Design a protein around this ligand. Structure first.
Ligand SMILES: Cc1cc(Nc2ncc(Cl)c(Nc3cn(C)nc3S(=O)(=O)C(C)C)n2)c(OC(C)C)cc1C1CCN(C)CC1
Length: 266
């Protein structure tokens, strides 16, 4: 749990996290991500309560010295949104990334979602910016890296990932997680585009509450799009839970017409 800081050497800034900047770091020699700053406690104990292969591991905290640190598993592949964007196939080197790689990422996150659902934990912010990769190449494993707004129970709410009952009522349940997962899937299969690409948050609210949903990402196979559309059913009771989602993802991985489908080139 507590790590003095005598052992903690920072190495490089990684970018700006939820509360602050995150560093690649070491401990002794464990390479780690050092996340910085109730909430302090909320974030910390939460991710540390879990034990699952598709959730980032917590190594410890450094709390008696300031700034305050949570030390997490270092995910050498960075975040999923950046990965998909920098690995889009191009005209210059067009990439190794294929449909099956996309389905594996999807499968890894759902398996982490399914662990949460089974433990009655509501994420509240399933989105590609919160997903990390063990490494950039084949055999990469995707993990959930940050937990949502159990730091809660705002143009700051991630409306584009939220179902109606969540944005209009403040109702969050596993089925509101299912909705967000559908949107992630869209993010995955569009290769990192912003959801509802040409719309504002206010437009989206209006769009979605009256039944509007996103078109398939370009070249998205029908069976994958169908998972999204099922995740976006208006009534939460009609949404699939994560064991169904994973079952469906897994059929996708077994259908050649899905996995042989080529990614669009940029
Ligand atoms: C985004 C990012 C993350 C990691 N590794 C990492 N590992 C473990 C954790 Cl828990 C983690 N969390 C984290 C990093 N950042 C910026 N924000 C967070 S966050 O608040 O925890 C949340 C938004 C996931 N990050 C990374 O490391 C390797 C390349 C060495 C590089 C990037 C790069 C993305 C794009 N490149 C160009 C620069 C940073």
């Amino acid at each position: 749990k507590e790590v003095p800081r005598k052992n903690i050497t920072l190495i490089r800034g990684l970018g700006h996290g939820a509360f602050g900047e995150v560093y690649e770091g070491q401990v002794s020699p464990l390479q780690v991500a050092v996340k910085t700053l109730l909430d302090f406690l909320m974030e910390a104990l939460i991710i540390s309560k879990f034990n699952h292969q598709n959730i980032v591991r917590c190594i410890g905290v450094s709390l008696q010295s300031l700034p305050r640190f949570i030390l997490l598993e270092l995910m050498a592949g960075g975040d999923l949104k950046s990965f998909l964007r920098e690995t889009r196939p191009r005209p210059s080197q067009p990439s190794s990334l294929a449909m099956l790689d996309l389905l594996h990422v999807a499968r890894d996150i759902a398996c982490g979602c399914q662990y949460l659902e089974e433990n009655h934990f509501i994420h509240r912010d399933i989105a590609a910016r919160n997903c990390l990769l063990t490494c950039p190449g084949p055999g990469r494993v995707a993990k959930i890296g940050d937990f949502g707004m159990a730091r809660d129970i705002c143009a700051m709410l991630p409306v584009k990932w939220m179902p109606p009952e969540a944005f209009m009522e403040g109702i969050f349940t596993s089925k509101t997680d299912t909705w967000s997962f559908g949107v992630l899937l869209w993010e995955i299969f569009s290769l990192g585009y912003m959801p509802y690409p040409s719309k504002s948050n206010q437009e989206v609210l209006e769009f979605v509450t009256s039944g509007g949903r996103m078109d398939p990402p370009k070249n998205c196979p029908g069976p994958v799009y169908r998972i999204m559309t099922q995740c976006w059913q208006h009534q939460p009771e009609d949404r699939p839970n994560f064991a169904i989602i994973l079952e469906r993802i897994e059929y996708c991985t077994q259908d050649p017409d899905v996995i042989n489908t080529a990614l669009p080139i940029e």
